[PDB]
Amino acid sequence: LVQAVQHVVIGPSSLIVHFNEVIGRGHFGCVYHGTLLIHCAVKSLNSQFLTEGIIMKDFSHPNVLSLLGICLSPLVVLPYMKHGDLRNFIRNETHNPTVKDLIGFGLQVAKGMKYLASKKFVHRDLAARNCMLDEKFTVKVADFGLARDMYDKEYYSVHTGAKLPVKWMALESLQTQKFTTKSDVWSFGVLLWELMTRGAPPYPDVNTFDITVYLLQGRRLLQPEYCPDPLYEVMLKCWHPKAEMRPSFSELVSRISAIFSTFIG
Ligand SMILES: CCN(CC)CCCOC(=O)Nc1cccc(CN2N=C(c3ccc(OC)c(OC)c3)CSC2=O)c1
């Protein structure tokens, strides 16, 4: 059996978990502050989940959340992310990110997704709520592999039994329930829109499963007030009806780099 957990196991003598310090919550379990013998986040789980998520051990990229290990109700040990999720970060009105900052965040997400696409890995739930910020404000694509969960149940709906983030899903995934790198690209465009609105909910006048017909009618998210025309063009390409006509993440990194660079920090 693929218990490659073996290589990833943190012995019981190497992890102190602080169960009184809940720093997060998912459908599968809580996240606790821990001490790895460094600071860390420790996600509780409550076979197929582990085997399908354990690939993340091989991943290392600055804009992708890494795995520190598994301790054994097994515990997934992840890097501490001081500034929480990206969506809450930008909704905090005590801080005013610049437009350059916000595009910067999307550029970092694009870089993380470029890496994951180059490893032939499909995220399936890319969204601002699922990216995390560390102490240096580096954005990490998260909520995948052993970190995979629903961290905000408002935005997931059932339909097979799966809980689907319908307002981030590509048109073909809404029809077929199948995901691909190119459906991640669709989601990426929605995340960009989230960034430019500082975390407004998409399609707020559309009841969850009325989204499919809305998109079939030839309709899309409207251009945010602070979103520059070239970036809205990127968003619209990301939501092309034909998957293969959507840009690659490599093209997105390049084009968003250019747009980012035209702004004053
Ligand atoms: C008191 C809360 N934080 C300050 C703002 C403490 C900072 C330290 O906490 C961590 O390091 N957490 C940590 C690290 C690695 C992975 C994960 C799991 N996960 N968490 C997600 C998440 C986290 C907080 C949220 O909102 C509260 C939220 O909302 C929709 C979603 C989605 S993406 C992901 O993979 C969590």
Side-chain angles (χ1 to χ4, degrees), residues 17-227:
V17 184
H18 307 107
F19 291 103
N20 61 334
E21 295 181 18
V22 181
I23 59 166
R25 176 154 35 251
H27 184 71
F28 304 147
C30 286
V31 191
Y32 306 92
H33 184 58
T35 297
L36 194 48
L37 232 76
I38 81 169
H39 303 299
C40 66
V42 177
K43 172 133 200 300
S44 179
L45 302 170
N46 304 287
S47 296
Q48 176 163 178
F49 176 86
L50 295 79
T51 187
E52 88 171 283
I54 203 157
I55 342 94
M56 78 174 298
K57 171 55 166 181
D58 302 335
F59 298 161
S60 87
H61 184 273
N63 310 115
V64 175
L65 181 75
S66 73
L67 174 66
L68 305 188
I70 293 161
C71 188
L72 21 69
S73 58
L75 275 18
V76 183
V77 184
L78 303 159
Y80 196 79
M81 297 296 289
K82 192 203 178 200
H83 291 291
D85 70 288
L86 184 61
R87 202 208 177 208
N88 283 312
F89 188 87
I90 70 199
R91 296 169 56 78
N92 182 186
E93 77 183 352
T94 286
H95 176 64
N96 202 325
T98 51
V99 172
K100 193 181 191 109
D101 291 351
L102 293 168
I103 302 175
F105 295 143
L107 177 60
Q108 297 179 68
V109 175
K111 283 179 183 182
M113 291 304 303
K114 181 175 170 182
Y115 175 87
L116 292 174
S118 80
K119 301 288 174 160
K120 293 168 179 176
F121 181 78
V122 187
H123 193 288
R124 298 185 299 178
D125 196 8
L126 187 60
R129 67 181 170 264
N130 289 333
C131 299
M132 300 294 290
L133 287 90
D134 77 4
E135 69 259 68
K136 301 194 178 180
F137 306 96
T138 299
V139 185
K140 313 279 198 196
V141 180
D143 173 54
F144 73 88
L146 307 181
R148 190 205 176 193
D149 210 331
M150 302 184 292
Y151 296 98
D152 187 348
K153 291 184 285 180
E154 195 192 307
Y155 296 100
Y156 298 84
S157 306
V158 186
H159 258 90
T160 53
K163 298 81 171 179
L164 300 178
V166 297
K167 297 197 186 173
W168 282 259
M169 281 166 64
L171 185 52
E172 70 275 12
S173 313
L174 290 169
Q175 293 175 120
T176 68
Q177 290 188 89
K178 291 181 254 302
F179 304 72
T180 59
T181 287
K182 288 297 189 206
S183 53
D184 286 344
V185 170
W186 185 294
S187 295
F188 178 70
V190 179
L191 186 158
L192 283 178
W193 186 94
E194 287 188 276
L195 280 175
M196 298 320 294
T197 56
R198 287 190 62 184
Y203 318 99
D205 61 314
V206 185
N207 292 351
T208 204
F209 259 123
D210 289 339
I211 186 57
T212 306
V213 294
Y214 184 91
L215 302 170
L216 280 174
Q217 286 178 342
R219 301 186 190 277
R220 297 287 186 270
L221 291 164
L222 299 176
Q223 178 176 2
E225 168 166 34
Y226 286 84
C227 175

Side-chain angles (χ1 to χ4, degrees), residues 189 192 221 223-224 227-240 245-247 251-252 255-256 259:
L192 283 178
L221 291 164
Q223 178 176 2
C227 175
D229 290 356
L231 186 68
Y232 190 54
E233 288 170 2
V234 169
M235 293 181 197
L236 299 175
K237 293 186 211 147
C238 287
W239 312 318
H240 194 278
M245 292 299 299
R246 297 173 194 142
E251 173 169 343
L252 292 160
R255 289 187 170 265
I256 291 171
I259 297 164

